[PDB]
């Protein structure tokens, strides 16, 4: 059922049955004041009905104003609800492919995972623990970084799937080959690591102190272009549908949402900068390294890290140090080429520059697959 609105858009009314103390199997995140259906979990009523979609904004549920609520309030609320739930939604503008037959993939884990030790887990309640040798039934890989799975030997009636890390096949030894950086085709320098470790600062210090060499990939946005902005260099200003289409078409390295608009750095954006003879400078979330490495961009990833816990206390609010060091225990993937321990910006910058400069004269080891 759909209802047109005077000022806003057309809303969507769906009805899903809810059992007392039994979750629907859908997760919600806050984007500004809005409540957004962010994920549909397999095995719940929400999934079976096929009435809720990722990206659907929840305006009302059974006469209750949902918009404006913290997701913690929405969580407490629906936990105390049952019976027929009438949803009033602003239907998702995302583009999911036509329904494929549920394809299960059975894997064996060669690593231990405890979601309570994971800072990155999107919905902690859904975290699924497993040990080396456990067999996982991966029901959904729609989210490359978070697979929905059941663990074989899970004695409790689940009934919902769990979330597990979507790691690529990391071998014990990965075959490597030397790659010389061409004179006119610089490798994109890409920075990763915790937030407040001066990463954004080191970028701008490079972009400014050596303006002639470095450049930035022109990102895309759904935000309407402003007065003193140019449609070429500031952003590629596109409609939301175009952005959503590009997302589905795997055209984005990384994309996020800011103030009810989408922003993202396209693969072509970087490939264009490479072709200019300039060094593309780009900060990414560790999560987005998967999409990045799978393209022929030949990136050089530098990990930017804070010092030890004790040395962090010397330089120093309290909730920040806990967050950094927690992210540092998870750096074991080691997709990066080199790490920089930022204690002093000036000391970190010179080391950063020295690393970037060295690419001109000295060849580097890349996965052999990049050259073949």
């Amino acid at each position: 059922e759909s209802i047109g609105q005077y000022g806003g858009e057309t809303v969507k009314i769906v009805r899903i049955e809810k059992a007392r103390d039994i979750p629907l199997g859908a997760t919600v995140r806050n984007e500004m004041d809005s409540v957004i259906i962010s994920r549909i979990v397999k095995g719940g009523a929400a999934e079976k009905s096929g009435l809720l979609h990722e990206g659907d904004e929840v305006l009302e549920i059974n006469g209750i104003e949902i918009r404006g609520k913290d997701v913690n309030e929405v969580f407490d609320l629906l936990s105390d609800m049952h019976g027929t739930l009438t949803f009033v939604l602003i239907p998702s503008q995302q583009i999911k492919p036509p329904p494929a037959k549920e394809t299960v993939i059975h894997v064996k884990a060669h690593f231990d995972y405890d979601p309570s030790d994971d800072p990155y887990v999107p919905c902690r309640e859904l975290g699924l623990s497993f040990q080396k040798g456990d067999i996982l039934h991966v029901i959904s890989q729609e989210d490359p970084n978070w697979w929905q799975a059941y663990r074989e030997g899970d004695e409790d009636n689940q009934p919902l799937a769990g979330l597990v890390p979507g790691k690529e096949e990391i071998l014990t030894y990965e075959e490597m080959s030397l790659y010389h950086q061409p004179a006119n085709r610089k490798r994109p320098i890409i920075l990763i690591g915790p937030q407040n470790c001066g990463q954004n600062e080191l970028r701008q210090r490079l972009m400014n102190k050596e303006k002639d060499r470095f450049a930035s990939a022109v990102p895309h946005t759904t935000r309407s272009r402003r007065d003193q902005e140019v449609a070429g260099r500031d952003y590629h200003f596109v409609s939301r549908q175009a952005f959503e289409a590009d997302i589905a078409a795997g055209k984005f390295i990384e994309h996020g949402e800011f103030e009810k608009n989408l922003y993202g750095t396209s693969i072509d954006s970087v490939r264009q900068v490479i072709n200019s003879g300039k060094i593309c400078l780009l900060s990414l979330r560790t999560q987005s390294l998967k999409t990045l490495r799978n393209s022929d961009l030949k990136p050089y990833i530098i990990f930017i890290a804070p010092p030890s816990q004790e040395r962090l206390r010397a330089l120093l609010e309290l909730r920040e140090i806990i967050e950094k060091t927690r992210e540092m225990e998870q750096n074991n993937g080691h997709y990066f080429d080199t790490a920089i321990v930022n204690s002093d910006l000036d000391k970190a910058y010179q080391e950063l520059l020295r690393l970037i400069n060295k690419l001109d004269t000295e060849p580097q080891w890349v996965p052999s697959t990049w050259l073949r």
Partner: peptide
């Protein structure tokens, strides 16, 4: 610098099960 692009670098909103 682009103010918006520095924001999207921050960790995504936490989810919660309904």
């Amino acid at each position: 610098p682009r103010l918006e692009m520095d924001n999207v670098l921050k960790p995504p909103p936490e989810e919660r099960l309904i």
